[PDB]
Design a protein around this ligand. Sequence first.
Ligand SMILES: [Ca+2]
Ligand SMILES: [Mg+2]
Length: 135
Amino acid sequence: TINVYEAEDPANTLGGAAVRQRDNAASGGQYVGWIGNGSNNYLQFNNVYVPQAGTYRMVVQFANAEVFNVVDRYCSISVNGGPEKGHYFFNTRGWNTYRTDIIDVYLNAGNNTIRFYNGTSGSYAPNIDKIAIAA
Ligand SMILES: [Ca+2]
Ligand SMILES: [Mg+2]
């Protein structure tokens, strides 16, 4: 681990309906919800800093208890305004149950942005607790 960033960090940008909410079960006692149902309802991590250009592992801590019978939640991930990389996040079976999954990201030396969104009407990303970047 080279850096951890809480979703609710006040440095971050929340668009639209995305919102910081309290959960004692979450890291830092908060998470970001209502990411999705249109690309304007986004979470952007600002100033994700690494010393070297390259591919890193981004460990995402999240909750997803959607049912249709559990289902995955899709999220689009854009690095530095780049093209979306889609990820299907498994079901944690409870909205207060936070697990992790890994997504590879290409970062520049210095500060980077990472945006989480889902542009599909009625479709939501998981709730995001925090991310960690590992070299
Ligand atoms: Ca958190
Ligand atoms: Mg995985």
